[PDB]
Coordinates of C-alpha atoms and ligand atoms in Angstrom, one line a residue:
Chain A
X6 CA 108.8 113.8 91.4
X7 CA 104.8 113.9 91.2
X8 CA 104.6 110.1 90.7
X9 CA 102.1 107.7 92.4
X10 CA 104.0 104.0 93.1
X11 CA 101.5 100.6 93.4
X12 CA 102.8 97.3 95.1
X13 CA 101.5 94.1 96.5
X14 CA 102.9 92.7 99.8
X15 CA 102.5 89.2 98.3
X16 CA 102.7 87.1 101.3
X17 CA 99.8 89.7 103.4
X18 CA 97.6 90.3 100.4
X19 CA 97.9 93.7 101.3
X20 CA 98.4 96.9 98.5
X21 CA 100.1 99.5 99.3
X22 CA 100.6 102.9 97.2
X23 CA 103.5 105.9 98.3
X24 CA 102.9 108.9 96.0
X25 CA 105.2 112.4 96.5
X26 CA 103.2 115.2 94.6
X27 CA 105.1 118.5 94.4
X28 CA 105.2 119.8 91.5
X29 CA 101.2 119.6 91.1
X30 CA 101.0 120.7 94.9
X31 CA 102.9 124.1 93.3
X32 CA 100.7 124.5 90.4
X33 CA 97.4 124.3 92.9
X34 CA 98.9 126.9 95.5
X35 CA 100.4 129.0 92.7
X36 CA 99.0 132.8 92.5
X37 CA 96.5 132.0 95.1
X38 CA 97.9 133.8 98.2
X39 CA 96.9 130.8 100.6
X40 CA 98.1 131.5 104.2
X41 CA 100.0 128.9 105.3
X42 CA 98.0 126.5 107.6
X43 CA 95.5 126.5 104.2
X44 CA 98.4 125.4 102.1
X45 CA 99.1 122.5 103.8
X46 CA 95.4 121.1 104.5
X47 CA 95.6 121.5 100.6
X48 CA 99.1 119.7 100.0
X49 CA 97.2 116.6 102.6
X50 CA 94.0 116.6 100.5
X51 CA 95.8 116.4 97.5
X52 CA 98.1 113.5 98.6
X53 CA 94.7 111.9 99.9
X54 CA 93.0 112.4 96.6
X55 CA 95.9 111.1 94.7
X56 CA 96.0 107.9 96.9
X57 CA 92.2 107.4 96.5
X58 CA 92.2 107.8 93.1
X59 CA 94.5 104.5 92.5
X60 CA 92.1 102.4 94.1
X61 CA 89.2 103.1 92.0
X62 CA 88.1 100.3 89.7
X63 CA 86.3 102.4 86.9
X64 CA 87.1 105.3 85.3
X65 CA 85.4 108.3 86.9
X66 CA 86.8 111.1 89.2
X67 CA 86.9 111.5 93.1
X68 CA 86.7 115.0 95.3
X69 CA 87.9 115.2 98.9
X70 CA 86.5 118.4 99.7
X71 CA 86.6 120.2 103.6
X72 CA 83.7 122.6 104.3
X73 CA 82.9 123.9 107.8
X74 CA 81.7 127.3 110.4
X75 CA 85.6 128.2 110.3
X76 CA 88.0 130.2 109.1
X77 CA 88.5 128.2 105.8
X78 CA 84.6 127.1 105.3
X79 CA 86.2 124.9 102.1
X80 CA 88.9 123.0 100.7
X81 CA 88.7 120.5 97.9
X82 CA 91.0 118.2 95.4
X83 CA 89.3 117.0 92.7
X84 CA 91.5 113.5 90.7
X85 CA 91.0 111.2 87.7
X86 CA 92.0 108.0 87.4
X87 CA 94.4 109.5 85.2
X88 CA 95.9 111.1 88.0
X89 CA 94.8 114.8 86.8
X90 CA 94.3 116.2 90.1
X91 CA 92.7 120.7 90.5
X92 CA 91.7 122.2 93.7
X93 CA 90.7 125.0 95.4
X94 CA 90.1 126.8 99.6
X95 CA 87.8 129.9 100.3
X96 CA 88.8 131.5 102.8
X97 CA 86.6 133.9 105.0
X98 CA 88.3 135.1 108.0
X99 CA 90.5 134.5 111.4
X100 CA 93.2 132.1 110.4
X101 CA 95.1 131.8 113.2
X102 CA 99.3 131.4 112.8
X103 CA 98.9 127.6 114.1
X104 CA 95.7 126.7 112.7
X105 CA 94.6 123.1 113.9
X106 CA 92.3 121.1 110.9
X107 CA 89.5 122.2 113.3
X108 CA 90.7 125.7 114.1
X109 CA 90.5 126.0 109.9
X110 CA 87.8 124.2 109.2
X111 CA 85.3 124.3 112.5
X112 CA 82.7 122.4 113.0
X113 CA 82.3 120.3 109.7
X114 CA 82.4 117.4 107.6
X115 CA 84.6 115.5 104.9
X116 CA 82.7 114.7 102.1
X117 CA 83.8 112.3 99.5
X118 CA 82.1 112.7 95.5
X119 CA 83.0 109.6 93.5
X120 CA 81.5 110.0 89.8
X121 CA 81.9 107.1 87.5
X122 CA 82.3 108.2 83.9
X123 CA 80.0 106.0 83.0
X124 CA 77.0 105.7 85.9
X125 CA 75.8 107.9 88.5
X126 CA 77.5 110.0 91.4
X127 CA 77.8 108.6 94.8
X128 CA 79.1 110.6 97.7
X129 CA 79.8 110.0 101.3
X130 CA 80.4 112.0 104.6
X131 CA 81.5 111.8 108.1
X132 CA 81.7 114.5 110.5
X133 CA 85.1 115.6 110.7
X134 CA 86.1 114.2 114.1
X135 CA 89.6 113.0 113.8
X136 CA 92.7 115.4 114.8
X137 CA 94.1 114.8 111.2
X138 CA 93.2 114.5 107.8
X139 CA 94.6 110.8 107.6
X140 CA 92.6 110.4 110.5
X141 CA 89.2 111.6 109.5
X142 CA 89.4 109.5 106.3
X143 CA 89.9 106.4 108.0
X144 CA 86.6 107.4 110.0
X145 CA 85.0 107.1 106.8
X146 CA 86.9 103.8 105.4
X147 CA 86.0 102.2 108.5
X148 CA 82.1 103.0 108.4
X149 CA 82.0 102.2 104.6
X150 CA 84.3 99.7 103.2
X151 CA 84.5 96.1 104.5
X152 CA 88.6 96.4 103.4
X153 CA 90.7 97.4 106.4
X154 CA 92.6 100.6 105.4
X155 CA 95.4 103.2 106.5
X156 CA 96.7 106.8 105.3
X157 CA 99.9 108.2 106.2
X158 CA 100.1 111.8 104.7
X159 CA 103.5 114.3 105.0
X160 CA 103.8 117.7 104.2
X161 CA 106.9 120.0 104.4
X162 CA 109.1 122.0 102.1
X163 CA 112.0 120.8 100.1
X164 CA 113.9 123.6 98.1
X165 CA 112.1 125.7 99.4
X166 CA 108.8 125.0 97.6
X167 CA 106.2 123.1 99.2
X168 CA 106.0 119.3 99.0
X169 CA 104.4 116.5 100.1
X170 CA 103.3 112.5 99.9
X171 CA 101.6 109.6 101.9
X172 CA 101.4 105.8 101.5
X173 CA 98.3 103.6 101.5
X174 CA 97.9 100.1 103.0
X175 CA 94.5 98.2 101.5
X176 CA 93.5 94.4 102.3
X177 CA 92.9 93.1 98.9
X178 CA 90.1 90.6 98.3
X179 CA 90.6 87.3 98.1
X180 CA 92.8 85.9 95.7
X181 CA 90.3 82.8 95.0
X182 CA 87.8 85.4 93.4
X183 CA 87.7 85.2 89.8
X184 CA 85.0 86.9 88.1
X185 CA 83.5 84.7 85.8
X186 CA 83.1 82.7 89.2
X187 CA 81.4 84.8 91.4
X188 CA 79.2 86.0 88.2
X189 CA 78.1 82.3 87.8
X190 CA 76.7 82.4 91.6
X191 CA 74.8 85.1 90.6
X192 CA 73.2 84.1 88.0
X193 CA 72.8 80.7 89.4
X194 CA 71.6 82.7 92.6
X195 CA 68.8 84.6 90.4
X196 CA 67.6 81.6 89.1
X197 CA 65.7 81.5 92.8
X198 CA 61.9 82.0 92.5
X199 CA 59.7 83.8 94.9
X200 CA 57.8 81.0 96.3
X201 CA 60.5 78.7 96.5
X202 CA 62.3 81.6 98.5
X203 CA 59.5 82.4 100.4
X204 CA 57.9 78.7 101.4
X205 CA 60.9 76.2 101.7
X206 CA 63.2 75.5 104.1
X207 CA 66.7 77.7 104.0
X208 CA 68.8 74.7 103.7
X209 CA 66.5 73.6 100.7
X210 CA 66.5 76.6 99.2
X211 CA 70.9 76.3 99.7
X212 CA 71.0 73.0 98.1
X213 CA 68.0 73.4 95.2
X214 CA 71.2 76.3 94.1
X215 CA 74.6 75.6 95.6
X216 CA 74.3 71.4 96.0
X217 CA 77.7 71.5 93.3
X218 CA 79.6 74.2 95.2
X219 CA 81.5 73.2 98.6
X220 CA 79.6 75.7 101.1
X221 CA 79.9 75.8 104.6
X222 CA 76.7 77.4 106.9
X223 CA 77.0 79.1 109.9
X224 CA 74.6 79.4 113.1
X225 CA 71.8 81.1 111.5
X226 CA 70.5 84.6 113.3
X227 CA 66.9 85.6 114.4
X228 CA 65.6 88.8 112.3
X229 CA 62.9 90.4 114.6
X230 CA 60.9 93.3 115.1
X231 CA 62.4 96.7 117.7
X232 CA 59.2 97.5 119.9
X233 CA 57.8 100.5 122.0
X234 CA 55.2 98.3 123.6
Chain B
X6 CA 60.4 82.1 110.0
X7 CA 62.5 85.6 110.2
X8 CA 66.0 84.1 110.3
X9 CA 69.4 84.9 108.1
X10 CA 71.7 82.6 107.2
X11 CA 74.9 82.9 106.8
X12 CA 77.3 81.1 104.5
X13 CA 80.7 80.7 103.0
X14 CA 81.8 79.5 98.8
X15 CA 84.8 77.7 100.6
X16 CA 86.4 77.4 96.7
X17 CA 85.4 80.8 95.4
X18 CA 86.1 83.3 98.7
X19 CA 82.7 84.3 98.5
X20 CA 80.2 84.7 101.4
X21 CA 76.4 84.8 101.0
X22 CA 73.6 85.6 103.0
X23 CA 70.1 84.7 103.2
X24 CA 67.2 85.7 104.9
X25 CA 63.3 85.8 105.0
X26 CA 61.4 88.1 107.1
X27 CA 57.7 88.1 107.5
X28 CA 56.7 87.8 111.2
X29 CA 58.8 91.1 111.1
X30 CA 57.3 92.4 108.4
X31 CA 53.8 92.5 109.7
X32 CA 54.9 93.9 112.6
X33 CA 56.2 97.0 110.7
X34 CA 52.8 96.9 108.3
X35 CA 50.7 96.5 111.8
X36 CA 48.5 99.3 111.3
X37 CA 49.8 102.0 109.3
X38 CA 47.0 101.1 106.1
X39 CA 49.7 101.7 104.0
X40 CA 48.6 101.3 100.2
X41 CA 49.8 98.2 98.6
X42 CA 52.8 99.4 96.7
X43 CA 53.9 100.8 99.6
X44 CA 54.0 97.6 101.6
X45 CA 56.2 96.3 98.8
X46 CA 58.8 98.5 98.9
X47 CA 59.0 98.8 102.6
X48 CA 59.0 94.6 102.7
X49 CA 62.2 95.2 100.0
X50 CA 64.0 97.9 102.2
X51 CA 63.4 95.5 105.1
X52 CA 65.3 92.4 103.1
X53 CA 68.0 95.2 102.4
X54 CA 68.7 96.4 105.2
X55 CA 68.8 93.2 106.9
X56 CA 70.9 91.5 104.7
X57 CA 73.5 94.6 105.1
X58 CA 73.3 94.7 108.8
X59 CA 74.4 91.4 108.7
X60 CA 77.9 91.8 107.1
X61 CA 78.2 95.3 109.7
X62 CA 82.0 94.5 111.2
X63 CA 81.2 96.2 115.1
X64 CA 78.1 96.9 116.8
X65 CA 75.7 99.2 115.2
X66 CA 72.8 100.1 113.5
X67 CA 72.4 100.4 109.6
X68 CA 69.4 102.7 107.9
X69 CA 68.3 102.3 104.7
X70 CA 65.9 105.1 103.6
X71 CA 64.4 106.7 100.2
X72 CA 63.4 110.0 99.5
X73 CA 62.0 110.9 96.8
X74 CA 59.2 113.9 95.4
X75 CA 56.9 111.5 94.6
X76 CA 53.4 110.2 96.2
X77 CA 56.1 108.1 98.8
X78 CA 58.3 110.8 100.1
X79 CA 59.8 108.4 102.7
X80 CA 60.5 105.1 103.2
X81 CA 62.8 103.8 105.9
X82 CA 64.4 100.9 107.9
X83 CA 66.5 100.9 110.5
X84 CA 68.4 97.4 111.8
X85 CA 71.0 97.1 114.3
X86 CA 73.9 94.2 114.1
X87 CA 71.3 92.1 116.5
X88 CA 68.9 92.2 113.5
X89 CA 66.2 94.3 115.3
X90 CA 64.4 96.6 112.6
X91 CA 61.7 98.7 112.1
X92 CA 60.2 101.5 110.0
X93 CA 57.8 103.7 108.3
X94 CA 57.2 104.9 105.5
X95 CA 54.8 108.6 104.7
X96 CA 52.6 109.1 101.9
X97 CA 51.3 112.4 100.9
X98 CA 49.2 111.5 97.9
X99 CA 48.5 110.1 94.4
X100 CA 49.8 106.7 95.2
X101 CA 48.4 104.8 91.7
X102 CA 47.8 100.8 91.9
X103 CA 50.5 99.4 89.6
X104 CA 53.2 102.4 91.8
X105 CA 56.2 101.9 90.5
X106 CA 59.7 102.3 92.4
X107 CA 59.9 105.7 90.7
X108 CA 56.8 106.3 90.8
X109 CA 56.4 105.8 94.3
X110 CA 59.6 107.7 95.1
X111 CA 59.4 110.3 92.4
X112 CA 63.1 111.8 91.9
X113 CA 64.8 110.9 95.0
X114 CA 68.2 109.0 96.1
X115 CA 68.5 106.1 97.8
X116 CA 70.1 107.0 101.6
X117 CA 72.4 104.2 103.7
X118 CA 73.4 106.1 107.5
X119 CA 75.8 103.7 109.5
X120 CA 75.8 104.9 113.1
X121 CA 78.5 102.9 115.2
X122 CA 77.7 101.7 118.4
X123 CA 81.5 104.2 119.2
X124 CA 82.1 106.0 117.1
X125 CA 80.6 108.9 115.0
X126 CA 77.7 108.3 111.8
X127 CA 78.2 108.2 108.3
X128 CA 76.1 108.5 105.2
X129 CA 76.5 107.4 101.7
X130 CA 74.1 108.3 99.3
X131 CA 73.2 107.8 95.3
X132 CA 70.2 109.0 93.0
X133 CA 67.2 106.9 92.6
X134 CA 67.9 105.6 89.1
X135 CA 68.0 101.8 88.7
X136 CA 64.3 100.2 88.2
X137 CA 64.5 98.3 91.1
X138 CA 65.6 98.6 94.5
X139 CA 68.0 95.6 94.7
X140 CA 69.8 97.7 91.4
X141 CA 69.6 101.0 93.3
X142 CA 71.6 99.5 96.1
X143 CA 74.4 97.8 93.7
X144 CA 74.9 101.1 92.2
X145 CA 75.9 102.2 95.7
X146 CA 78.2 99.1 96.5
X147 CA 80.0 99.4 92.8
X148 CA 80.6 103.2 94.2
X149 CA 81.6 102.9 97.5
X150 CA 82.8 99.3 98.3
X151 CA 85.6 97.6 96.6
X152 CA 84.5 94.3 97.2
X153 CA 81.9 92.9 94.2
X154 CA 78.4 92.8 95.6
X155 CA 75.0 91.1 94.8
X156 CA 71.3 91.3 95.8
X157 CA 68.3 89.2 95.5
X158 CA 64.8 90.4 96.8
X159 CA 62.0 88.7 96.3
X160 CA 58.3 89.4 98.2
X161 CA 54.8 87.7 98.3
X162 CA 52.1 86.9 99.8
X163 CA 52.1 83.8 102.1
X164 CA 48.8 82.3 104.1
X165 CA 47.1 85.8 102.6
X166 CA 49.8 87.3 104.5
X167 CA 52.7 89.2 103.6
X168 CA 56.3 87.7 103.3
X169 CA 59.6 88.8 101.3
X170 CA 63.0 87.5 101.5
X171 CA 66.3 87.9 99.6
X172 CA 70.1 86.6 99.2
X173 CA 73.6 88.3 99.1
X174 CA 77.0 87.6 97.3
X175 CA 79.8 89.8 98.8
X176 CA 83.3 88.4 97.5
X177 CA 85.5 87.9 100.8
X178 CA 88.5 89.7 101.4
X179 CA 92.0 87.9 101.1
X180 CA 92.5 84.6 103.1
X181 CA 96.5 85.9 103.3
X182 CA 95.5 88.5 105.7
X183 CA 96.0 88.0 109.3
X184 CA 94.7 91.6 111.0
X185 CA 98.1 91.3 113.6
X186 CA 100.3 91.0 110.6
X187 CA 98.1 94.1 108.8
X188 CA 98.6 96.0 111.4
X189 CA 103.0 95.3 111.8
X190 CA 102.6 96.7 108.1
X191 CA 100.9 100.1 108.9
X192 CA 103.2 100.1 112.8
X193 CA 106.1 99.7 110.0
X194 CA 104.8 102.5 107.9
X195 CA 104.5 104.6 109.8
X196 CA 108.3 105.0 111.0
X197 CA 108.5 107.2 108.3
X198 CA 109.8 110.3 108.3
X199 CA 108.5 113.3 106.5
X200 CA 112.4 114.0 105.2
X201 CA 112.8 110.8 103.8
X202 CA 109.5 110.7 102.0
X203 CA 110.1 113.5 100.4
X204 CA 113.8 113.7 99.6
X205 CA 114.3 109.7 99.3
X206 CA 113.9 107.9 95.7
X207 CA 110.7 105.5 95.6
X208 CA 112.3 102.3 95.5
X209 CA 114.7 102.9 98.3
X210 CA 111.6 104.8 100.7
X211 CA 110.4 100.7 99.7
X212 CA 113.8 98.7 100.8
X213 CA 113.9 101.2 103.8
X214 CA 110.6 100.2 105.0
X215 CA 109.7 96.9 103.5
X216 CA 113.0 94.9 102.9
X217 CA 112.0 92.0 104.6
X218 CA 108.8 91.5 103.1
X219 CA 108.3 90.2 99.8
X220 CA 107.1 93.0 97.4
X221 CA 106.0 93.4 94.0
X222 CA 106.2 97.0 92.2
X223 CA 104.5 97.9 89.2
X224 CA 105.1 100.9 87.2
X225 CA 104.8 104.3 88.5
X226 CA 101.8 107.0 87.1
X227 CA 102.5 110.5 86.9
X228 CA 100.4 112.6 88.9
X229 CA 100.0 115.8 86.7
X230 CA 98.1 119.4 87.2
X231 CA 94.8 119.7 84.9
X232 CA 94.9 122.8 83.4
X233 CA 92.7 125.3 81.9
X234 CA 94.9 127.5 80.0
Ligands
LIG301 ZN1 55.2 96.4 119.9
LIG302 ZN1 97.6 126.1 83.6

């Protein structure tokens, strides 16, 4: 059905996302001669890609691209936030019948390219540790966004053809937030100078700025120097 | 007085941080002669990287470093989620007085490496293109991390010695969500099957799943092929 579905567990403040993506999967694998184990890393990247690409909060694109010492040295899916999603695998050798995600890709990394359309690119990488796919990317979610996350990615054939989805489960952030708010703090925030920063007290320097806002402070912690003495 | 404090908008779910560190500091100048402009931005990475250490979620360390082809080629600091830091910085030439944070670095990125106390590392990385450092490091967040995020760095010279310090706005995820009750969602989630994903309408993969929960849908988004043809 190629159709990416958004919903809001309202009671959890948790998103979630399902998307099925078939008939794009077809039109990535088509005239390609992909053995079979590199068809379906392929069909998983591209449901991954897809699911990624909802959460973004610009406009730009996102590439979840493989690349390794094995068999298949690189798989990528490049999506929009249109959902316009194009790939590619190169191939270069020994893929074995039941190819593993580390049998095709080796030793190796998954590395995530998000460019805004306005600003500039930012990418990430972990070293691809996990078993699966879903697993690996939740490696990187967990070592880079504060939001608790989970993938669930499918693959098989229907009709003969291949298919596949996956769903997405995201904390969302509070629902107090508003953004003229928390742009307010900030500029309220900025309005700090150097030596007031730098010579008062901490609490001072919390109530010369926040003494309006309700603001609870916590134990504070000692910042100190790592010797080799 | 090398502390952080930590602190909580109780009406806008948004957290802040603040910190000064100069007995720190000098520790990491102690010795090095490093030119003036120099001392700067290593007293802005150490504010940086101490304020992002401080919102880590398990036990690790955090690295913020540049790299650059300019009279600066490195500058780095290291913390761990105990706020221990330390660093260096390497200089192989024309350093002028009034250095500039591009001038310094040359053409460069800014480079964040989150190593887990478990598991395995991950990088993130963005060009060097906002004027300061505190806007180098936003670009990264508005990138990588869903959550809105601010910093404020400020340095000086206090008692002829040096001192910096800086703030941090991060808005706070969801009140709503309890991590056992995040968790029952993905448990849930995961008792799909591969058949039903992709064979099943949308809305009834949803009612399957999720009909005891209260759930809001929005409209589905195509997910299309880009071609070139
Ligand atoms: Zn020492
Ligand atoms: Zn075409």
């Amino acid at each position: 059905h190629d159709q990416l579905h958004r919903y809001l567990f309202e009671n959890f403040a948790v998103r979630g996302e399902l998307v099925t993506v078939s008939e794009t999967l077809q039109q990535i694998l088509e005239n390609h001669d992909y053995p079979q184990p590199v068809k379906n890393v392929l069909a998983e990247l591209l449901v991954a890609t897809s699911l990624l690409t909802a959460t973004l909060k610009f406009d730009g694109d996102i590439t979840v691209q493989l690349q390794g010492d094995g068999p298949m040295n690189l798989a990528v899916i490049n999506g929009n936030n249109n959902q316009q999603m194009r790939g590619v695998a190169r191939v270069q050798g020994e893929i074995p019948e039941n190819a593993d995600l580390k049998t095709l890709v080796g030793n190796g990394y998954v590395v995530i390219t998000i460019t805004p359309s306005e600003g500039e690119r930012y990418q990430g990488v972990v070293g691809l540790e996990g078993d699966t796919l879903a697993a690996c990317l939740e490696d990187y979610f967990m070592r880079s966004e504060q939001l608790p996350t989970r993938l669930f990615i499918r693959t098989g054939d229907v009709d003969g053809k291949p298919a596949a989805g996956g769903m997405l489960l995201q904390v969302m952030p509070a629902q107090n937030a508003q953004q003229d708010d928390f742009d307010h703090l900030a500029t309220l925030t900025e309005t700090i100078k150097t030596e007031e920063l730098l010579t008062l007290p901490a609490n001072e320097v919390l109530w010369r700025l926040y003494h309006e806002e309700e603001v609870t402070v916590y134990d504070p912690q000692d910042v100190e120097f790592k010797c080799t003495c």
